[model samples]
Target chain A: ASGAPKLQPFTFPKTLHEGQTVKAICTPTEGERPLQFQWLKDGHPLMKRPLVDIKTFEDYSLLKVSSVGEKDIGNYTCIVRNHHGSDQFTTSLTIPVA
Target chain B: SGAPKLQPFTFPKTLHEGQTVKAICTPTEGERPLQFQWLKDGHPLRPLVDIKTFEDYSLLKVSSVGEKDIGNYTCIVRNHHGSDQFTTSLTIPVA
Candidate 1:
């Protein structure tokens, strides 16, 4: 109980097919309310795109991506920082060929 | 079950891109079932990490180091009794 955002586990697939829609949830088990969320791709700040939608609430944040493409494959990380400290979660999406 | 007594570790003074960085965190004195964690600037990421009991140490190895990897890395060792941590700074020159 250091007053940091300790995120609750959510689901995110590492492998996705083309044009698949996936949503990842990030919720803090305990932390300050009105938590700030920053999304990064491959360690870089991510900007809003037509296929990507990020909706953040007081308790959770939703990262939704539709129409997965070649450029969508990378490491997506959600970083939550509060008055006390920072917490984060990362997931890598890849397109495997048969 | 005892407290983890982690040692202070440092990184290479000179860092370059595409270089391989292998850092080891060892407790000269501690108990069994020690937990080791590596965080980047208080955050976290994925890399090649392993716990070795041969010499009683844990290692975090990453290749192709770049700006994304340049930061203060904190190694936390915890046990049932207590916990200890140390931070190491890593910087690289621009291309």
Candidate 2:
């Protein structure tokens, strides 16, 4: 176990389009093990709350958006919390519609 | 051409009936021309919703909190590419 969880930043797809699968991951560079992770969008519980899958390993967590659409255009946040403290990292995802 | 990811912000935790509360929202990631808006209980915070904007950040303030001001508040920021919001509640004890 380390100190407070310090999460490393992750990236989103450059050209996100409809019907594509997107997965954004959160990995703590240094921290205590057995951390908790949650994914939220626009500061509220995500629209399709149940469909999204959250999986965790010993020290990291993964957030999967099985499919993408206009409804999925927003800033996604990964909240990592441990006994010591909490840290958040966000992914700004936008799919242009024309 | 960017996403405005808002930094954590705060308002008075010990809100009273006659004291003012203010919350400032800053962006940790994004570009210029960010648009900021405020809402209370899911509706636009009109006139009483005092708003101020600086170069990169914005603030929402309410003067002299009353029974009408007890609920959730949200600060939203947008830059052409994407937008993010942060919300916190203001719960005052019953007299």
Q: Estimate each model's TM-score.
A: 0.48, 0.46
Model 1, A33-88: lDDT tens digits are 65788889899998999889886555557677777788888888888888788788
Candidate 1's residue-wise lDDT over B1-95, tens digit each? 45776645567565467655555576645676778877888976545333233234566656566777788888888877888899988777786
Clashing pairs in 1: none
Q: How far off is residue A58 in model 2, in Å?
A: 50
Q: What DockQ would candidate 2 receive versus the native complex?
A: 0.02
**How high is the DockQ of candidate 1?**
0.01
Best by TM-score: 1
The CA lDDT at A83 in model 2 is 90
The global C-alpha lDDT for each of the candidates, from Candidate 1 onward, is 0.68, 0.69
Candidate 2, residue B38: the lDDT equals 83
lDDT of 2 by residue, B33-94 (tens): 88888888898874665777765666566666678888888888888888999998877666
Worst 10 residues of 2 chain B by lDDT: B10-19
Docking class of 1: incorrect
